[PDB]
Design a binder for this molecule. Structure first.
Ligand SMILES: [Zn+2]
Ligand SMILES: [Zn+2]
Lengths: 6, 41, 43, 6
């Protein structure tokens, strides 16, 4: 899983 | 909380994009270089 | 000769096409691909 | 800087 910080 | 790219050390305010995995971060600039590496060999 | 793993997906160097190292982290070609889709914003 | 492990 990945997440967008910016 | 201020986050930093784990690969180049730049803060989120110094890059255009910042993506995170489990306790790891990577910016657009590093991703860009990674693509060059992958497309290189 | 130590087993190195992608910091994002956990796959080892022996499971991916390429493994790239930062100071104390690693990323494989597969995860670089996922990051591209995100930065590109399309699937 | 980035370095190639594989
Ligand atoms: Zn970076
Ligand atoms: Zn990976």
């Amino acid at each position: 899983a990945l997440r967008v910080v910016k | 909380k201020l986050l930093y790219c784990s690969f180049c050390g730049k803060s989120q305010h110094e890059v255009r994009k910042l993506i995170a995995g489990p306790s790891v971060y990577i910016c657009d600039e590093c991703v860009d270089l990674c693509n060059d590496i992958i497309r290189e060999e």
